[PDB]
């Protein structure tokens, strides 16, 4: 079975550097052109760099030329991408992808790894501000009601949200975060509950952010 396993991705700041590697197995690594191809979240595919079977030829996308360097170790079945002078727009999943054959003209990918995520951001680590999203009027009395928590301006991902310490999970919708222009994230978590429950029952959202060692409870009231 052809296998390509990439690693070394992670968070890093613009201007900084990172080295990715890809360990290959299940084919004769030495006789194929190998590529790096990247995918920005929710975007299409962009070829980055490729290297001939014998390391006689190396090619780069113009977006990346002069900052990335590709190399291979035929003795260890391993491919490297040294990425320098990182920019925010280099943020993407990076796939290692075997070419069809050995030479540049054969460089179209046939097999791809699962890829490694590279997040390039200048944001500093920051715990969220947690605000209540009070239930207002939407459905009615003897109906259901929606209330929530706004988790504003944190970095990096991820944040965990529970309600009443994990005791309330039914009716909970926690939405994927928005990445703002500030480079900071925000998300929301809403719970739907009986309207008649408002002001006899209490609803506290618990917001956990490991990076900033932040643990915040917020009581959400009418």
């Amino acid at each position: 079975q052809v296998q390509l396993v990439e690693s070394g991705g992670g968070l890093v700041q613009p201007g900084g550097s990172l080295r990715l590697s890809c360990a290959a197995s299940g084919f004769t690594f030495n006789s194929y052109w190998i590529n790096w191809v990247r995918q920005a979240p929710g975007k299409g595919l962009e070829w980055v760099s490729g290297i001939a079977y014998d390391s006689s030829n190396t090619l780069y996308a113009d977006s990346v030329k002069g900052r990335f360097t590709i190399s291979r170790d035929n003795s260890k079945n391993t491919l490297y991408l040294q990425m320098n002078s990182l920019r925010a727009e280099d943020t993407a999943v990076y796939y290692c992808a075997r070419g069809l054959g050995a030479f540049h003209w054969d460089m179209q990918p046939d097999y791809w790894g699962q890829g490694t995520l590279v997040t390039v951001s200048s944001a500093s680590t920051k715990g969220p501000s947690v605000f209540p999203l009070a239930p207002s009027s939407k459905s009615t009395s003897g109906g259901t009601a929606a209330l929530g928590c706004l988790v504003k301006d944190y970095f990096p991902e991820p944040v965990t949200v529970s309600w009443n310490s994990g005791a309330l999970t039914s009716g909970v919708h926690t939405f994927p975060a928005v990445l703002q222009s500030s480079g900071l994230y925000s998300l929301s978590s809403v719970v739907t509950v009986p309207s008649s429950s408002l002001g006899t029952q209490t609803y506290i959202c618990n917001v956990n952010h490991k990076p900033s060692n932040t643990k915040v409870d917020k009581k959400v009231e009418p």
Partner: protein, 210 residues
Amino acid sequence: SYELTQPPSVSVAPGQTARISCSGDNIGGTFVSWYQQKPGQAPVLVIYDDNDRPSGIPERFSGSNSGNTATLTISGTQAEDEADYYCGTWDMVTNNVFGGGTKLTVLGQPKAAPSVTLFPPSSEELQANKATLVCLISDFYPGAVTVAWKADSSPVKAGVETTTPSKQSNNKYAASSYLSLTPEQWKSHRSYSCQVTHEGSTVEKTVAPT
């Protein structure tokens, strides 16, 4: 040189034939490859060198390439064939190029319109000299939405951040939009609305200062 252009979206009924085209200036003189990518997964090659099929790829996938157009044909399209499809070529100038991708849907669920919930800034956030209006969009299918805000019927572009739709846990989609203002801005218009349009029609929620 080399842009390859694909239609963003193609739909087929089960058992109908899907055709996804990929266009470029004399693409007929390159070797076209096609990749299928499912959510959260690596691309998989389905056709290479215009019309050849890797072993393991069902015989319903076939390819063609002439002139300015290359085409991937799937006959008897099945539910599992739902994915993004990318065409790819190599050329001396730009090396490996990819089309922008084409999402293929096999008419899979019934349509569902979005639920929209819109929260005004909290009294807590206004005391901290900020204000965010939060617009939550859920339970829609298929998964594309267009969101817009107004400050008393007057359009807003400033201060708006919107996520892209993500598949839920019941086969429908969710998104969110946030409009960040200052407290004075927030008091300076008499009302505000997120207007959510889902293939078809427009849903709206509105809020006013207190």
